Amino acid sequence: DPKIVNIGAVLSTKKHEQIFREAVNQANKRHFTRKIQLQATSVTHRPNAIQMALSVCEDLISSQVYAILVSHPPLTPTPISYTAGFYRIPVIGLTTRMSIYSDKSIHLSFLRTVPPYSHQALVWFEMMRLFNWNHVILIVSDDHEGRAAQKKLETLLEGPKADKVLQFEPGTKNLTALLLEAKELEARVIILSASEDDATAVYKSAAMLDMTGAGYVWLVGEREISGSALRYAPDGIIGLQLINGKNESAHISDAVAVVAQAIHELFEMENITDPPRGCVGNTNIWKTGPLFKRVLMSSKYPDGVTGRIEFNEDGDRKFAQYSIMNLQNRKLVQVGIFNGSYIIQNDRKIIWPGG
């Protein structure tokens, strides 16, 4: 008999539980599992954060999980990160994109197989080189996500330069003062980070100031061409969609592969201890937790369903693939992809604002 090593998951549906089950069973098939052999333990999301925390203890940590997969319900991963982090049990985010999960102080054992929204700056930057936009205006919401995008782009720039950064208070509906400050500047290329509703307010104000026509380039991310943002978005706008970013099934499969590889790598080392069994009466960290986190952080899985899987220094997905989308006659049209490191233009012509 082998040593049985539990992996946990908090997932959206029973269907996705079964997928996780089958992924773990496949990992057992394809790995050499005389010594150690994985076992799937899963629940679905609870209705509120306190019940979810309790469930992590009662359902998962009671089974001594070495790691916990967590999907964003479509109520956040946060309670699961908190509770699991208490013990230094690693959490793998499957679909959560918010930049806040990259903060070690808050989420101190958290990796994810999708990138945070802020990493869209990586694509903007390659776009700016490609189309030789050397002077841009950056408009970001004055919240965490907005400031995260700013920091990320400013790091890449510091070739092309930002002529100015403008931040606005989230939830503001008349943005003409801010947008007037951008109109006076010379650069005509405008990059936007904002939630759905805040992008809407921007697009409206920009249209009333006639900043959405010929001359101007608008470069945004995924949130800014989603839901209601899309409904008032100007033609010619360029935006992004994370390929497979919403495919819980794809990420379950990839996350399990990575975690299974990492478990087997872990157990080549000496003096591996088990995680605590249950929460009750246990207040010490899992001593091997920090080691297992390092092994995950450095895991490389080239043959992923979502592409090439590595993690950066914050445990965020690297080599993510984006669709480059262009609003033409009010339809979203793919004009290229960012394949992880390289921009590939397809045969469909970009139509800019105006044209």
Binding site: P47, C57, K104, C279, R294
Partner: protein, 356 residues
């Protein structure tokens, strides 16, 4: 006058009798001592939720005898989720949490991060120690610590010289000897350390391996590193200096008294202006639906309470406003020893010159 329920939760050895002894308004407290054995997330959540579904709990006063700073994090989580006032008055429950939730009604006895950092520079100026480095982990607050120092320095006509700031990642194992390589970069004779007690235990063990604990190096840490001063890890270097609120002149009986008063006064003050107080949540299981019916309105009163002509007010950030702090020094017998008070924004030290 109507009665509000207040749970007083005590973890670990405590004299309940002496407590129930230290203990005019529009409302009147019904106090309820609960003892608790464990301080894991489940035990703490389950205990408080069970309390809230048996009795009608307006507020929670929490004290423990551990060094577990995580207790404060758990309580803030519970407070924000259920919108219930919780005071962490002693132990891990009072170990500063930076960045409490927007909806938190969690308040802690003891100094903010920024105030401790201010005290630490005052100690340095007294003995003309102007050259120093900073070591922190990623423990929440560490940025607020570094920033407070930096902006005090920057705005001073004094010849401060901050030489190095180290950030230590102890979420990963140290089999590459990273922390050792970082520590071996320190030259300064004063080193300010921000981290948890358990983290400092490890950091000191490593610093010693590299010759940084002995003479020529003085380490200064905040309250939560000293923690319970009757528990002194062996790795802690003789000569360690700490700001402390561990329990010197402000005893647990008195703390529980003031805790009960703060919640009671605050509720009275609200009933008097608005002709209602918020109704005790009767469930943690239900907090998602009943949420538009709840707010943290009681906070604005929680923070402006005078009792027995003692100003007990909190900051909006949820720490005590004017704590009398005790500066302590780990002596040759490896006991913690009083060597200073920080009273009225004034530092009063015992020694003009440090003995060894």
């Amino acid at each position: 006058p109507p009665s509000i329920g207040i749970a007083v939760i005590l973890v670990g050895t405590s004299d309940e009798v002496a407590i129930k002894d230290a203990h005019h308004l529009s409302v009147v407290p019904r106090v309820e001592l609960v003892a608790m054995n464990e301080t894991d997330p489940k035990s703490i959540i389950t205990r408080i939720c069970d309390l809230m579904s048996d009795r009608k709990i307006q507020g929670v006063v929490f004290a423990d005898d551990t060094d577990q700073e995580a207790i404060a994090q758990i309580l803030d989580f519970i407070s924000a989720q259920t919108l219930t006032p919780i005071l962490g008055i002693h132990g891990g429950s009072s170990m500063i949490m930076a960045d409490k939730d927007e909806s938190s009604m969690f308040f802690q006895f003891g100094p903010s991060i920024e105030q401790q950092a201010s005290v630490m520079l005052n100690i340095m100026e007294e003995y003309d120690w102007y050259i120093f480095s900073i070591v922190t982990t990623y423990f929440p607050g560490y940025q607020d610590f570094v920033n407070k120092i930096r902006s005090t320095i920057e705005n001073s006509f004094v010849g401060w010289e901050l030489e190095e700031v180290l950030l230590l990642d102890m979420s990963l194992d140290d089999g590459d000897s990273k922390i050792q390589n970082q520590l071996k970069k320190l030259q300064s004779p004063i080193i300010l350390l921000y981290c948890t007690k358990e983290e400092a235990t490890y950091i000191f063990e490593v610093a010693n391996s590299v010759g940084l604990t002995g003479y020529g190096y003085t380490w200064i840490v905040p309250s939560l590193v000293a923690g319970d001063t009757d528990t002194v890890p062996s790795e802690f270097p003789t000569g360690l200096i700490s700001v402390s609120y561990d329990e010197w002149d402000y005893g647990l009986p008195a703390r529980v008294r003031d805790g009960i008063a703060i919640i009671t006064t605050a509720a009275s003050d609200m009933l008097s202006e608005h002709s209602f107080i918020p109704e005790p949540k009767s469930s943690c299981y239900n907090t998602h639906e009943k949420r538009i019916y709840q707010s943290n309105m009681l906070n604005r009163y929680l923070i402006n309470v005078t009792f027995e002509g003692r100003d007990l007010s909190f900051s909006e950030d949820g720490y005590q406003m004017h704590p009398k702090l005790v500066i302590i020094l780990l002596n040759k017998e490896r006991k913690w020893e009083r060597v200073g008070k920080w009273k009225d924004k004034s530092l009063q030290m015992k020694y003009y010159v440090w003995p060894r």
